[model samples]
Target: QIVVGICSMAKKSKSKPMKEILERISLFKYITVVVFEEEVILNEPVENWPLCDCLISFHSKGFPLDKAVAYAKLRNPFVINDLNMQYLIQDRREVYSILQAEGILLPRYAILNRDPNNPKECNLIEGEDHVEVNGEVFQKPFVEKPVSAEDHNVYIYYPTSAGGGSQRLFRKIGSRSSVYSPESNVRKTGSYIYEEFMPTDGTDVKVYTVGPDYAHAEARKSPALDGKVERDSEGKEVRYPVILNAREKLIAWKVCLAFKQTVCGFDLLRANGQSYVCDVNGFSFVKNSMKYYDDCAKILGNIVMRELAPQFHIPWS
Candidate 1:
């Protein structure tokens, strides 16, 4: 009997991406699949959680990550996205530093560390002109991203000459994509990475990888464009398949290899005639695509079965 488990918030588990993937994966009767919902996950102690041979787990809001980590340690199951790296992914500072060390091309940015001892004293500076991180003089119109990946309070400040307005982006709420505030200041509560914003005609490529060899990209208008969500008849964010240039494909491969990620998604910006990785999301999926789900099932099933039960030859996998 092969046992494979997916552990994430119920919302993600119920999403089309995971839902369809689970449906397809369950068709392989040999593989016993399970879902860990937040309702029970939060109530039950980790020690009482069901045993899983291999678990596909990742970070999300309200996820009992520490408990999951302890459970993984206790059981020593085969985990996707290495549990330790989960924490690392939440910290943009770590993500960027690792990528920078790997010689990846990134936006020119600087880290402005907030005084953790006193978060209330230092609010966002009223002006974007006074930023000098480690002697790096970054100008206005740069983007300020919190080191906390989950903290989606990303702010982009415009230069005075450009009329001095800023855009704020957060987790999507209803149909609202983002908010623009005039005479706004970047949040000063947490450490942030200020990077030069890429100009890409208002759209960015979201590259989703099943692995280094295979990737699927879709293009979407940036929320920072007008703070208005673009939707289709289904009221879903408008996105379409995109083809990556050869060099861009190479960058995607490098990201997968470096991160040891089997499935990942990251934001790619094509500017200055080159591709730059704006963010590296550790675990991501292509929503509402049967073709993608089919691929996901085969690859995930193969990986899960081969690792846990290699003796049994699985043709489908």
Candidate 2:
């Protein structure tokens, strides 16, 4: 019997599918799942983490991920989304820069200064000569986003030639419901990036990759398409299935291998027969509705079973 451990900080509603699938699978005779919320995980001890043969976790919300993973490694458990991979993906600028240089298609991006509390000090250009914040001008229709992680505001600033002024901004694009506002009191002052925005037909491709050659992709309308969202009867956004060409798949493979992350997802924009990777995410929750989740679970299950086989076998055999 194989013992697998599942840990996550995501909402129960979001994590239910992965949990239920793993539990029902016959690959492992027994498994332990621990979902942590604020003020709940403090009681867990590092010595107690070796209770399973494998450890898979979302590692969100202030969890002691390092300590727990260290203990799990001591027990020789199969771990998913290793620490190095997580940190590598979190730094958007570094990851994109590497991929972009490796002949992988990526948007033209330049890092911006954090400019604490003062917007005028934020300069998107690289050199000191172009010191003025507004002096260096990019081609019309560029993107501005945080250089760190997700769940933040993304703005698309158009050039003055397109009727947009430095003071009078055009559209504000964000991953969530709200648009980016420079004047927002809650906005954090940190380094950001300005990238050349590639126009699509208002759709973004999300490719979920597992291991080396297994990948599934889907296309969804951009939430910032027209700054309006269309929902289904259940109030869910619609996502259409997309088939990745050989080139795109190869790019995904290269990216996963480069980051040393077997399980991941990346976003792409296809324009004029060219596909460019815009974002890379580590070990995301596979939504229940998508068949790709099942594919991923099976792949992971097989991998875990293979790894644990020798341990469970008799030496004389």
Best by TM-score: 1
Q: lDDT value for candidate 1?
A: 0.80
Against the unseen true structure, what C-alpha lDDT does each candidate score? 0.80, 0.63
Residue pair clashes in candidate 2: none
Model 1 worst lDDT run, 10 consecutive residues: 119-128
Output the lDDT of residue 287, model 1. 87
- Model 2, position 77, has a per-residue lDDT of 67
Model 2: per-residue Cα lDDT over 191-299, one tens digit each: 7776777989889899877776887788877754544555567666667878999999998788767766667778899987899988887665445454665677777
Model 1 reaches what TM-score against the true structure? Answer: 0.90
lDDT for 42 in candidate 1 is 85
